[PDB]
């Protein structure tokens, strides 16, 4: 006769901790900004940004992603 | 004769901690902001942003993805 | 004679914390803003934020996703 | 003239994780166990346990405790 | 003329993590045990355990404690 | 004129991790165990732990304490 027993056992622990996790900023201060334009010409897409003090945290990572394939074949 | 006993377990554990997290921000100050613009000319989309203080968080990522694939075939 | 038990077990967590959680600001703030604007032209869309203190959270991320098949097939 | 602004402000964080978490305990076995008594003699309080496989957790600590006074006085 | 401003802040993170934490016992077995008591005499208490496996975890500990004073006095 | 600023900041991070943390038992075993008692005589508490694998944490330890006193006096 025969027997066949097909137990595989995943217990594992996947953790992902990503951008800016436990900081502390303490009194940061930004400075004055001026910006003065005169005449300029532009001939395709302008993009601007004009702050003081940015504080930008940006995350495409850290997914945590698993591909897992079992099988089982008899005669 | 013939027994299959087909019990593969999942047990684990999955867990994304993704952007900004846990942090102190303590007195953050932004600077003045002067923008001044004369006889400018734009031929394509202008994207502007003006501020003094910003704080962004931006998470495309992060997500937990699994995949898993079962077969048993006899004869 | 024969028998198969086909008992595949998914007993598994899955967590996703995605944007911004737990931060904390204390007292932020933003300074004086001033745009002046003369004699500008613009021939395609204009797309423009002015502000002084924002804070801003987007999360396209931070789902969790489960494909799973199963298959069983005798003679 | 005389101002007092008396504002004590408390944003801090406390956490206890006392006891048994988060540990994995795969296929453990007990043996046989056997007990046999005779002409014993007890004269005062018995407290017995007999067992096998014996999972215990036990937490009198793990408490947080906050105590906070606070006092203004004028003239 | 006079000004007090009395504003202590507390921002401060604290943590307890106590007893059993996130261990792995893989296949784990306790013997055979055999106890045999003849003609015994006990004039007092008797606190008995008797098994094979025992996995015990005990906290008393792990509290976090906060003892905060405050005080203002003018004149 | 008089001004008083009184703000002190606790930012500090505390942190406790006691007893058994991340800890890999693989296959422990215990041995066989037997105990033959005859004739004895107790005239006081008989305290009796009989096993064969025990593990066992004990956490007294491990509180984080905090205790903090302010005190601003005027005239």
Same mark, same amino acid.
């Given at each position: %006769?025969? *027997?066949?027993?097909?137990? #595989?056992?995943?217990? %594992? =622990?996947?953790?992902?901790?990503?951008? %800016?996790? +436990? @900081?502390?900023?303490? =009194? #940061? &201060? &930004?400075? *004055?900004?001026?910006?003065?334009?005169?005449?300029? /010409?532009?001939?395709?897409?302008? *993009? %601007?940004?004009?702050?003081?003090? /940015? @504080?930008?945290?940006?995350? #495409?990572? +850290?997914? @945590?992603?698993?591909?897992?394939?079992?099988?089982?074949?008899?005669?």
């Amino acid at each position: %006769s025969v *027997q066949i027993v097909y137990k #595989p056992v995943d217990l %594992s =622990k996947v953790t992902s901790k990503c951008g %800016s996790l +436990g @900081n502390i900023h303490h =009194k #940061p &201060g &930004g400075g *004055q900004v001026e910006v003065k334009s005169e005449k300029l /010409d532009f001939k395709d897409r302008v *993009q %601007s940004k004009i702050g003081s003090l /940015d @504080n930008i945290t940006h995350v #495409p990572g +850290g997914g @945590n992603k698993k591909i897992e394939t079992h099988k089982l074949t008899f005669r």
